[PDB]
mmCIF file with all atom_site columns, C-alpha atoms in Angstrom:
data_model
loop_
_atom_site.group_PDB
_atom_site.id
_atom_site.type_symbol
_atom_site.label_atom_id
_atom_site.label_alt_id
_atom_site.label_comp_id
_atom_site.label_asym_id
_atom_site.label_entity_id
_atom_site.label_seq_id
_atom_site.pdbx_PDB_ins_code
_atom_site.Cartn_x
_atom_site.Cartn_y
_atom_site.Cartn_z
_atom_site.occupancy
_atom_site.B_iso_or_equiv
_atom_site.pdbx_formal_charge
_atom_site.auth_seq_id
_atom_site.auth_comp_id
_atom_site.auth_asym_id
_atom_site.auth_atom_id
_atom_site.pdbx_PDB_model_num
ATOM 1   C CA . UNK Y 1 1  ? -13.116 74.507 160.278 1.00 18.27 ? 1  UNK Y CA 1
ATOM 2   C CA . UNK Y 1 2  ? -14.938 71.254 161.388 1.00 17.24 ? 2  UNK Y CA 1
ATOM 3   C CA . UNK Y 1 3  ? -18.615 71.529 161.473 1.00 19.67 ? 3  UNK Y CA 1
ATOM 4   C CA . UNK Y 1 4  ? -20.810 68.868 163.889 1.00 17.87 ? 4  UNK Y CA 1
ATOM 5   C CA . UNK Y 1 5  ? -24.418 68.686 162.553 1.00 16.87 ? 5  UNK Y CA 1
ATOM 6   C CA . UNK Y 1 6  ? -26.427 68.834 165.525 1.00 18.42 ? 6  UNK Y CA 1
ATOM 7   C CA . UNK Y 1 7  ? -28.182 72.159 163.375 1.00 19.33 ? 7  UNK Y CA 1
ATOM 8   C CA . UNK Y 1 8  ? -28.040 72.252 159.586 1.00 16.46 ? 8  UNK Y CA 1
ATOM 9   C CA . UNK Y 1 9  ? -24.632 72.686 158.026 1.00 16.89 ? 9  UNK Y CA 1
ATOM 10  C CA . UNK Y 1 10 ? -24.957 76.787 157.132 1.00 15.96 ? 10 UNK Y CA 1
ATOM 11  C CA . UNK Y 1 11 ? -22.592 78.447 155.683 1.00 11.51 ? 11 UNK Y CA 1
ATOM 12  C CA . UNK Y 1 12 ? -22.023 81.771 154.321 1.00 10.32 ? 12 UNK Y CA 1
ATOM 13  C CA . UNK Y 1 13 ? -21.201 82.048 150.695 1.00 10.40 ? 13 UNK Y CA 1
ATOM 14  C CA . UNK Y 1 14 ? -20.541 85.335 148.524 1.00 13.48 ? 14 UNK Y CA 1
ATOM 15  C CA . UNK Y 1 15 ? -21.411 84.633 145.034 1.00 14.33 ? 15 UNK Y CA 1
ATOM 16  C CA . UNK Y 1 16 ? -21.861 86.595 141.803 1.00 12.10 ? 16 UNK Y CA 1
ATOM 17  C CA . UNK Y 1 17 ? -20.630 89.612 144.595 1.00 9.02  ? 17 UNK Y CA 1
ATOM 18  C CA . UNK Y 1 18 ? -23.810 88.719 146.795 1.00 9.20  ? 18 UNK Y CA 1
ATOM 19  C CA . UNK Y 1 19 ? -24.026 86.801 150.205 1.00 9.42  ? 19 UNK Y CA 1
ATOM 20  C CA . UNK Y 1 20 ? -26.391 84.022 150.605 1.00 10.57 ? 20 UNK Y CA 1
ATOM 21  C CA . UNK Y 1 21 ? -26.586 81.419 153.324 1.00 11.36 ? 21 UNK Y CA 1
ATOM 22  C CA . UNK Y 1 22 ? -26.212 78.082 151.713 1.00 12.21 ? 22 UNK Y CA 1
ATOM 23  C CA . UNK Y 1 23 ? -26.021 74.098 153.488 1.00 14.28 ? 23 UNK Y CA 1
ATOM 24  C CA . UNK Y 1 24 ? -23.041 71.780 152.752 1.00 11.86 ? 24 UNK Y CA 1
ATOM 25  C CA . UNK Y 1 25 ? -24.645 68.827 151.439 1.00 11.49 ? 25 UNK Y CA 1
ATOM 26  C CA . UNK Y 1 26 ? -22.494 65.433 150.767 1.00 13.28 ? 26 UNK Y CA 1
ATOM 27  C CA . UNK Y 1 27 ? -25.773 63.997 149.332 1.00 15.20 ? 27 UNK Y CA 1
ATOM 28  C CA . UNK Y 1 28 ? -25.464 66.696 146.793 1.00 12.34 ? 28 UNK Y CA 1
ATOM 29  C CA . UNK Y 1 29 ? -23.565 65.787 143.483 1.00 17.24 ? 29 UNK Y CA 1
ATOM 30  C CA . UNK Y 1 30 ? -23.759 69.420 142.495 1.00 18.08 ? 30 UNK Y CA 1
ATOM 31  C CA . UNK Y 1 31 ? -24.956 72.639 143.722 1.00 15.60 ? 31 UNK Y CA 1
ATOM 32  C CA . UNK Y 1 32 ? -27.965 74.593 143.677 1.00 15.63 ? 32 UNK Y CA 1
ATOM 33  C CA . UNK Y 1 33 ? -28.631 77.947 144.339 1.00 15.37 ? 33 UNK Y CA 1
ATOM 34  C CA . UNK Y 1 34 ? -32.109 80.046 144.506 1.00 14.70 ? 34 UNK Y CA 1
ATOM 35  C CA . UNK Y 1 35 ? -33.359 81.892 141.829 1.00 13.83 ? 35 UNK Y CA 1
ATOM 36  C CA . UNK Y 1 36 ? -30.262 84.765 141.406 1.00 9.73  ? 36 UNK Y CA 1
ATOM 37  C CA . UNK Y 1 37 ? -29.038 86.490 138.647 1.00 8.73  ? 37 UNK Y CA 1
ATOM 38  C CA . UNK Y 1 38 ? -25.330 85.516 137.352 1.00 5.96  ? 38 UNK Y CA 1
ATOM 39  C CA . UNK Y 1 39 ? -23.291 86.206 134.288 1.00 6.64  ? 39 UNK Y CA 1
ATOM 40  C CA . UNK Y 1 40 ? -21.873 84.004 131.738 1.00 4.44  ? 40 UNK Y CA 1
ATOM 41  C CA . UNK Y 1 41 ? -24.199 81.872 129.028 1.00 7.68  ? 41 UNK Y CA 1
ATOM 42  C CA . UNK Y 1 42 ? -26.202 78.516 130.219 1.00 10.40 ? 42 UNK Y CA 1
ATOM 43  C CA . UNK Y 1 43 ? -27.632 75.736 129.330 1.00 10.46 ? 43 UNK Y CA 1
ATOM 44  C CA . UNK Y 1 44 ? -31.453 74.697 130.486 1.00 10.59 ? 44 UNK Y CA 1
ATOM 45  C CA . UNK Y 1 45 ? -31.062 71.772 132.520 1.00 11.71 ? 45 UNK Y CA 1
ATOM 46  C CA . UNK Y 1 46 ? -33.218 68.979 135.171 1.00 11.31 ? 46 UNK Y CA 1
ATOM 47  C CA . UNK Y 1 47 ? -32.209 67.570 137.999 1.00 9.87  ? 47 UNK Y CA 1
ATOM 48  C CA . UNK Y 1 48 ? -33.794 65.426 141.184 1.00 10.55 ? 48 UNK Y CA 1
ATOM 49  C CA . UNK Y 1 49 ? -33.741 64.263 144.511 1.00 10.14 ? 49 UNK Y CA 1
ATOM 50  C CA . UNK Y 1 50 ? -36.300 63.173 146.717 1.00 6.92  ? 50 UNK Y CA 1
ATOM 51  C CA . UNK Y 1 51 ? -39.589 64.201 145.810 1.00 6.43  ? 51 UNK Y CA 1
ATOM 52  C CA . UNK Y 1 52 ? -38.463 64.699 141.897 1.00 3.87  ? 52 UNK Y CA 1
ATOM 53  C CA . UNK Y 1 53 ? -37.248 67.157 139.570 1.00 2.93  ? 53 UNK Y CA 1
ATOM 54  C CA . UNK Y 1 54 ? -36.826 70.703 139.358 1.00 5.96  ? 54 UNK Y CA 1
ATOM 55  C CA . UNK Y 1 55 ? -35.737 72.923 136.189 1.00 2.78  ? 55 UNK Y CA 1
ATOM 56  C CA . UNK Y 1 56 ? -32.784 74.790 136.448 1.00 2.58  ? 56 UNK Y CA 1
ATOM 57  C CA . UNK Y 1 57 ? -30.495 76.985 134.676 1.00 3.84  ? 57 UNK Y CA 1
ATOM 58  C CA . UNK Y 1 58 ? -26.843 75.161 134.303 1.00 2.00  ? 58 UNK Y CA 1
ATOM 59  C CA . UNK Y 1 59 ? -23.792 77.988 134.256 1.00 2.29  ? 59 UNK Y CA 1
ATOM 60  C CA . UNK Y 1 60 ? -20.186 76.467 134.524 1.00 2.00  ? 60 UNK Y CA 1
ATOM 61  C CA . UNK Y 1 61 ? -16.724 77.720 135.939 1.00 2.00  ? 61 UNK Y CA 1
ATOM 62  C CA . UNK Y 1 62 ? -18.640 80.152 138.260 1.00 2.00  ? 62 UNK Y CA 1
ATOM 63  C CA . UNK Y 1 63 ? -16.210 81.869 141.390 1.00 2.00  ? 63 UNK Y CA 1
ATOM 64  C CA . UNK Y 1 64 ? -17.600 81.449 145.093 1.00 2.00  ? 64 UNK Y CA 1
ATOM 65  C CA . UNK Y 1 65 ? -16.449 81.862 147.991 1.00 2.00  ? 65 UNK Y CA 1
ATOM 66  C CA . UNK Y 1 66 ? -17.774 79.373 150.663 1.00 2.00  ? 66 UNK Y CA 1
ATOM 67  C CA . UNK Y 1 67 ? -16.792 80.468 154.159 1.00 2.00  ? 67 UNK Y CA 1
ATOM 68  C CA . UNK Y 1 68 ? -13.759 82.321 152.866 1.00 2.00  ? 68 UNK Y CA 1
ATOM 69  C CA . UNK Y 1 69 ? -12.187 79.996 150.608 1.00 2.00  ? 69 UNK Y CA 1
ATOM 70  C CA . UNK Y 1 70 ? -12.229 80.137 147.397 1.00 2.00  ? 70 UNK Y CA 1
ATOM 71  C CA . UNK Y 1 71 ? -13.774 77.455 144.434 1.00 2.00  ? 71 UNK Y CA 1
ATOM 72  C CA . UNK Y 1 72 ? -14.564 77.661 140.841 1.00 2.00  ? 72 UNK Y CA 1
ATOM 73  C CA . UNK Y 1 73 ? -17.505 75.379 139.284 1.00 2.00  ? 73 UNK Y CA 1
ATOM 74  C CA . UNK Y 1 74 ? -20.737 74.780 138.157 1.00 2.00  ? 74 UNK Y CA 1
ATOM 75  C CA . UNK Y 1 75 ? -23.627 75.891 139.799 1.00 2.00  ? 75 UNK Y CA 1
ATOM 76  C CA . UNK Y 1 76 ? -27.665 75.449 139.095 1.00 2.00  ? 76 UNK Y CA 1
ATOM 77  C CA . UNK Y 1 77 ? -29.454 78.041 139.469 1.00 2.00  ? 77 UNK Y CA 1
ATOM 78  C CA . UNK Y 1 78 ? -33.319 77.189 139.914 1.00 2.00  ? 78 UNK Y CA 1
ATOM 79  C CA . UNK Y 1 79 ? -36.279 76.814 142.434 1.00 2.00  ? 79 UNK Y CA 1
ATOM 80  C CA . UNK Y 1 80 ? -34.804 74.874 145.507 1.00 2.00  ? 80 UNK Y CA 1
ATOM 81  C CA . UNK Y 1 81 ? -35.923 75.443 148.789 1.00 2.00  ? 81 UNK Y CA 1
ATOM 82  C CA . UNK Y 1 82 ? -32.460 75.915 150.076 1.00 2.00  ? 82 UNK Y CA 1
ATOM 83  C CA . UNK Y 1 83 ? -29.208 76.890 148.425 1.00 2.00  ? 83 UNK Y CA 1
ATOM 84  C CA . UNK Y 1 84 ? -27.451 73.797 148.452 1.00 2.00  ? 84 UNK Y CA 1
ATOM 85  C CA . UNK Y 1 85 ? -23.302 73.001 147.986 1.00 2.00  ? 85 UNK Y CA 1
ATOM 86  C CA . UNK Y 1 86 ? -23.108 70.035 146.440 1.00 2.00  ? 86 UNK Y CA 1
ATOM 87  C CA . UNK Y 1 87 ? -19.660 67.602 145.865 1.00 2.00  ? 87 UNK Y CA 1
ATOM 88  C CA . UNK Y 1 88 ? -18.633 69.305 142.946 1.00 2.00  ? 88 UNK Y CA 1
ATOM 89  C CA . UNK Y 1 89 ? -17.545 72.970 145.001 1.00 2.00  ? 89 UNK Y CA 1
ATOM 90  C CA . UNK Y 1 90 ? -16.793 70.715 148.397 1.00 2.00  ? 90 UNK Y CA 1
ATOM 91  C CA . UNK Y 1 91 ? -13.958 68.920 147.215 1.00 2.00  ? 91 UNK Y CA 1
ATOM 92  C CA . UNK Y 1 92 ? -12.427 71.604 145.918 1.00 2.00  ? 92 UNK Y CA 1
ATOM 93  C CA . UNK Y 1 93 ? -12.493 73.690 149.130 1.00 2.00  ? 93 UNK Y CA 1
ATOM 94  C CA . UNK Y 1 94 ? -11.003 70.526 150.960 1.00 2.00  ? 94 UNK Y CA 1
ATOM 95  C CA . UNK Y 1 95 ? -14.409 69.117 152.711 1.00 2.00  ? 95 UNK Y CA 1
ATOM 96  C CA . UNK Y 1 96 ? -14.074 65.907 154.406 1.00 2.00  ? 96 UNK Y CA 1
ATOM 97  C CA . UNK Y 1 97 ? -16.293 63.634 156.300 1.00 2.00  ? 97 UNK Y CA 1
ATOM 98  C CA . UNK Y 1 98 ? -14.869 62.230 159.233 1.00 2.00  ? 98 UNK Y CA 1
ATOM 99  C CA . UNK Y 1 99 ? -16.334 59.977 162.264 1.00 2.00  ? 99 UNK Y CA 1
ATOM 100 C CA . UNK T 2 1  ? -12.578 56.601 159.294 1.00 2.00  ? 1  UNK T CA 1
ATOM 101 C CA . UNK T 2 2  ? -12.104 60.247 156.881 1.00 2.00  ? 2  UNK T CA 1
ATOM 102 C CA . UNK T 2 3  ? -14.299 60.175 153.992 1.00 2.00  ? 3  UNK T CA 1
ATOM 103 C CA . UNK T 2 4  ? -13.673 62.413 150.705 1.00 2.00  ? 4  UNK T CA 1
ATOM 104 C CA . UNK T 2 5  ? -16.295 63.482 148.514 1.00 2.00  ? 5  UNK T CA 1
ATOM 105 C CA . UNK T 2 6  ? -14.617 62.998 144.806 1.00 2.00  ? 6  UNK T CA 1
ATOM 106 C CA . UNK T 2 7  ? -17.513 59.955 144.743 1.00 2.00  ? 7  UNK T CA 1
ATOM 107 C CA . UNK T 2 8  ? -20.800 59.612 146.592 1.00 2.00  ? 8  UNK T CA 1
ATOM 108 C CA . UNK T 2 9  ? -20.408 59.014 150.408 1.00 2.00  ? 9  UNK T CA 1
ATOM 109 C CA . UNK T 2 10 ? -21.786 55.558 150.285 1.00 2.00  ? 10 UNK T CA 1
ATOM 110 C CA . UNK T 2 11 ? -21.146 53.366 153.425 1.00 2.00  ? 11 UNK T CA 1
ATOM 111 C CA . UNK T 2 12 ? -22.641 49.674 154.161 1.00 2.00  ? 12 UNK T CA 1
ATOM 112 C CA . UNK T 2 13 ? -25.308 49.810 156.920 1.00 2.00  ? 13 UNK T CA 1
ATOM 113 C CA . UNK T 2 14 ? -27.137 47.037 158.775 1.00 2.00  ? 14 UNK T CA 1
ATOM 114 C CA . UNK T 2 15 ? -30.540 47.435 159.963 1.00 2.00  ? 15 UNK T CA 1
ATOM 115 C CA . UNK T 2 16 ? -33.158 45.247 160.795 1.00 2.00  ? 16 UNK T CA 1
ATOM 116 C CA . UNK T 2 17 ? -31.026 42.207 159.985 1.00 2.00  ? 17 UNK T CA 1
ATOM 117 C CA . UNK T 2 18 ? -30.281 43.634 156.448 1.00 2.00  ? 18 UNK T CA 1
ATOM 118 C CA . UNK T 2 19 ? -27.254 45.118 154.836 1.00 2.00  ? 19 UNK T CA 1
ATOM 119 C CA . UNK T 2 20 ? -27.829 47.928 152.474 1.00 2.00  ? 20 UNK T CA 1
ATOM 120 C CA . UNK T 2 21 ? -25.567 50.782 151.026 1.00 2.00  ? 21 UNK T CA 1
ATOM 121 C CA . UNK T 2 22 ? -26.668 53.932 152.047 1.00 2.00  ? 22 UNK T CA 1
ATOM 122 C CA . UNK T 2 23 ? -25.416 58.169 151.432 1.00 2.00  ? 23 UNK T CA 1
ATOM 123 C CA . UNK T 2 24 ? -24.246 59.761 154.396 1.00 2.00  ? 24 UNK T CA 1
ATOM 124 C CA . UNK T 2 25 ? -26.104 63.041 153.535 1.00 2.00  ? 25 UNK T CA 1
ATOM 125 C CA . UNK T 2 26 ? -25.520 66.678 155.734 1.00 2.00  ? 26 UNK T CA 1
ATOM 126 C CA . UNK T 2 27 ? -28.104 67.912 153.576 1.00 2.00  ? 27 UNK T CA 1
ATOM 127 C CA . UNK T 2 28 ? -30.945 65.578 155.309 1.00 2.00  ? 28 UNK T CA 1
ATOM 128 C CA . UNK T 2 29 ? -32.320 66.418 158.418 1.00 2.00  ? 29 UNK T CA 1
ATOM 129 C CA . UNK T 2 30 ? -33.500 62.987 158.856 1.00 2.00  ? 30 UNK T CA 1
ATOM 130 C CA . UNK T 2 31 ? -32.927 59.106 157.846 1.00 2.00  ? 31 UNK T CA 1
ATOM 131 C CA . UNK T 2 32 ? -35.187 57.627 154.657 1.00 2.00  ? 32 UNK T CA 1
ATOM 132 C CA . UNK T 2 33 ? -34.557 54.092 153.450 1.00 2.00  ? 33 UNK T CA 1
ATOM 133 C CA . UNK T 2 34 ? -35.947 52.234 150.666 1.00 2.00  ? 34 UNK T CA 1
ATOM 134 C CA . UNK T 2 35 ? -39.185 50.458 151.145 1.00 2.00  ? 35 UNK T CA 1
ATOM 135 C CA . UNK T 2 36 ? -38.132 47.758 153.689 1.00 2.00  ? 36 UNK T CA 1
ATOM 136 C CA . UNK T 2 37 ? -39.406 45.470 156.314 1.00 2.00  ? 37 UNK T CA 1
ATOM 137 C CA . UNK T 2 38 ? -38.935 47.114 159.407 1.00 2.00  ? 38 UNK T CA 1
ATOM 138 C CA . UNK T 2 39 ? -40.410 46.632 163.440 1.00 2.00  ? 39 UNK T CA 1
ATOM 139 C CA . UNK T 2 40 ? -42.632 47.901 165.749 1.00 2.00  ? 40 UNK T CA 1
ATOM 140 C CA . UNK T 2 41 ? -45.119 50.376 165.551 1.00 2.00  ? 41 UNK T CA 1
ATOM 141 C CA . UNK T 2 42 ? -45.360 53.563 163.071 1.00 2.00  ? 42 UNK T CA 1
ATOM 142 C CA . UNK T 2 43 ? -46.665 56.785 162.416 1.00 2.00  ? 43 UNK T CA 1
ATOM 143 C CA . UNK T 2 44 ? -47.498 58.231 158.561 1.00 2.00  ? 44 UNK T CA 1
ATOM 144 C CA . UNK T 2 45 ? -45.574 61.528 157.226 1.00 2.00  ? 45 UNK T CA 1
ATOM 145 C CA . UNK T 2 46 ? -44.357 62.725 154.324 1.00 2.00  ? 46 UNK T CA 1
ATOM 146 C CA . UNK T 2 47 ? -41.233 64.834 153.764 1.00 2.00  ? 47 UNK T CA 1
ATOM 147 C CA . UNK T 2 48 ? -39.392 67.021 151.422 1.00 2.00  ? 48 UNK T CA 1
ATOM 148 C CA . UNK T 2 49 ? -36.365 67.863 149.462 1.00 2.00  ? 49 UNK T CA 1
ATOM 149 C CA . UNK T 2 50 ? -35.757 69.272 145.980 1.00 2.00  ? 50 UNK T CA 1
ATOM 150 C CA . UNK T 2 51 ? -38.299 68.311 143.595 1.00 2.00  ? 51 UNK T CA 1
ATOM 151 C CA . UNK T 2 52 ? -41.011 67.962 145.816 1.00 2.00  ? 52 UNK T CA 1
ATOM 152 C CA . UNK T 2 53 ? -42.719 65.554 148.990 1.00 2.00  ? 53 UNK T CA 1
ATOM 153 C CA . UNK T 2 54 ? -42.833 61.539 148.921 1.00 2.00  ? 54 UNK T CA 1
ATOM 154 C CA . UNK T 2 55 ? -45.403 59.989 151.437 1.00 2.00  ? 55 UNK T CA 1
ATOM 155 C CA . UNK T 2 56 ? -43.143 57.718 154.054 1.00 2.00  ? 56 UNK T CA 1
ATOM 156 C CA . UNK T 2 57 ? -43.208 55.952 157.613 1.00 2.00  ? 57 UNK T CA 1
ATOM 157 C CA . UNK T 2 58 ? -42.111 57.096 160.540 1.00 2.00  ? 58 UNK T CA 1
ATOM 158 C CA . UNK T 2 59 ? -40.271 54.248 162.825 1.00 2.00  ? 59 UNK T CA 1
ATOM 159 C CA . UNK T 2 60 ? -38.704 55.638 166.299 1.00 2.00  ? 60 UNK T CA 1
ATOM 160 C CA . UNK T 2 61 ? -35.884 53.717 167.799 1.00 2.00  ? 61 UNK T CA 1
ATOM 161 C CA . UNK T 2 62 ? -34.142 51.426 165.502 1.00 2.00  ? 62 UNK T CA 1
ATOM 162 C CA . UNK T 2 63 ? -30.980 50.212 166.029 1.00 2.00  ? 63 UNK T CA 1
ATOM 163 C CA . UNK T 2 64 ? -28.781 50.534 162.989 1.00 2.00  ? 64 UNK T CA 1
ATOM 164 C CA . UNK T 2 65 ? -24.971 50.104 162.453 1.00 2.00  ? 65 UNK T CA 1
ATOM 165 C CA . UNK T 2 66 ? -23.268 52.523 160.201 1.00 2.00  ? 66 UNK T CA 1
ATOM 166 C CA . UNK T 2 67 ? -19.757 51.231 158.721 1.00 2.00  ? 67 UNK T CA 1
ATOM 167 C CA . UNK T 2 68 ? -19.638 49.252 162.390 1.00 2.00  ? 68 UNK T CA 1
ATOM 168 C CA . UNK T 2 69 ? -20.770 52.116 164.884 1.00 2.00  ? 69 UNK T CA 1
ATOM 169 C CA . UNK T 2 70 ? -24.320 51.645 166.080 1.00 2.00  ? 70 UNK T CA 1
ATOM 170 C CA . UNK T 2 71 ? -27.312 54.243 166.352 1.00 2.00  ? 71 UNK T CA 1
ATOM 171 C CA . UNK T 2 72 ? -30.404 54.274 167.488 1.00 2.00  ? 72 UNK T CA 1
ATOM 172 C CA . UNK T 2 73 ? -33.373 56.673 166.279 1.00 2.00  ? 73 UNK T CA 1
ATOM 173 C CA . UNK T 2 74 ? -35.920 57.531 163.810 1.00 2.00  ? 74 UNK T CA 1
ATOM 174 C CA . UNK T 2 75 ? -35.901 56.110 160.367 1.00 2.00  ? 75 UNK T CA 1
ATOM 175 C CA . UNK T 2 76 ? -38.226 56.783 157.611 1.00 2.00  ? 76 UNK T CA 1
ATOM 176 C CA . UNK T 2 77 ? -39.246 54.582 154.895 1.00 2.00  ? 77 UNK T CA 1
ATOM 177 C CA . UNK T 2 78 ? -40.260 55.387 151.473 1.00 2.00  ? 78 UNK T CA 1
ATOM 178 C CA . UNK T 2 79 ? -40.141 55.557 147.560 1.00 2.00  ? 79 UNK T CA 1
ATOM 179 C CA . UNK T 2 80 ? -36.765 57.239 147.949 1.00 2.00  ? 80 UNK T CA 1
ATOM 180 C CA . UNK T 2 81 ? -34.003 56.835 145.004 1.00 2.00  ? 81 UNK T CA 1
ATOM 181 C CA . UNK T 2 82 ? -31.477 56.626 147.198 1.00 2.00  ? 82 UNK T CA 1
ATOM 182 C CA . UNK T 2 83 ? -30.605 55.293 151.047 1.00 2.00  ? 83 UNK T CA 1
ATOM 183 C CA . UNK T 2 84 ? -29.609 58.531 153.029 1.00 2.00  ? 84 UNK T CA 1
ATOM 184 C CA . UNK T 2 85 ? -28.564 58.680 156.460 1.00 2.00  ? 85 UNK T CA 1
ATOM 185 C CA . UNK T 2 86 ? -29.470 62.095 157.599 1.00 2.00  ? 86 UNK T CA 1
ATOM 186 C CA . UNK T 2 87 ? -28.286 64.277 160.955 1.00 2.00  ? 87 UNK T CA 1
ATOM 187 C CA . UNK T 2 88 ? -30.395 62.448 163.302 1.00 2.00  ? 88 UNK T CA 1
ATOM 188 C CA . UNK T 2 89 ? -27.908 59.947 162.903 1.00 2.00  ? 89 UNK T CA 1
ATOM 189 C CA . UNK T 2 90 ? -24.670 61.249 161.884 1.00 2.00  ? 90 UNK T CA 1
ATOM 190 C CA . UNK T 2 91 ? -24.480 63.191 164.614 1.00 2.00  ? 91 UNK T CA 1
ATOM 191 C CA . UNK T 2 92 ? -24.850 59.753 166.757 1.00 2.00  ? 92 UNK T CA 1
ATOM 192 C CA . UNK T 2 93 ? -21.766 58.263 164.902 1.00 2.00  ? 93 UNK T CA 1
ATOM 193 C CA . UNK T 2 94 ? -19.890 61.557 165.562 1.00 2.00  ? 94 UNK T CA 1
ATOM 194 C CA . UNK T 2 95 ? -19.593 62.404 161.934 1.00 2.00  ? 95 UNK T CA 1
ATOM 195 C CA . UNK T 2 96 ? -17.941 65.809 160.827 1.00 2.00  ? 96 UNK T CA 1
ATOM 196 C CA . UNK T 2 97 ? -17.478 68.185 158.565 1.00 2.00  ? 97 UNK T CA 1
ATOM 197 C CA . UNK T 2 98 ? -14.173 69.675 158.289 1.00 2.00  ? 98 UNK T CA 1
ATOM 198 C CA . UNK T 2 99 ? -12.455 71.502 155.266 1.00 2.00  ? 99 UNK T CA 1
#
């Protein structure tokens, strides 16, 4: 699909088998989710953007689905306003910038 | 031009006589820019992302070329890490998502 940005870039996503509504972010090197629960081990981890850091737990090679295709990765897990898909899960799914 | 996300977005912007590099970011509602000179009037705000708030100011209705399309709107400017040109803009340029 191509996706204007007049509104935020929302997307639905089905992760450890929930749905969430997440943003495509190309300002994001990875991605972020909201405080869930998801298998696997992880390591503690901090990252930042604009107004600083946040903790987060770190778990790699994680499944989602992101609108209906399909991407393997790491994902954050931690206390971000917004779940956010970051580069790392976009370019596997084949997201491009154009203008 | 289509931009791929295997590196940070990063395109060459002018504004206010200057050239900068800035992060074409779907994840930002609006612009912020690195503490710069910038005209006219301006109101105070401060904004948010992950991590937290910085304190910034609001400028309405600069001009600003983006990889050689021009825009005009609000820009913010602030302790930010990183130049981002948010939606208020993009969608100016005609920038898209598609995957």
């Amino acid at each position: 699909p191509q996706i204007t940005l007049w509104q935020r870039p929302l997307v639905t996503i089905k992760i450890g088998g929930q749905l969430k509504e997440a943003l495509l972010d190309t300002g994001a090197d990875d991605t972020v989710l909201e405080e869930m629960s998801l298998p696997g081990r992880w390591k503690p981890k901090m990252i930042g953007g604009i107004g600083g850091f946040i903790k987060v737990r770190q778990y790699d090679q994680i499944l989602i689905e992101i609108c209906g295709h399909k991407a393997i990765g790491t994902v954050l897990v931690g206390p971000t306003p917004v779940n956010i898909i970051g580069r790392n899960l976009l370019t596997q799914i084949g997201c491009t910038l154009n203008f």
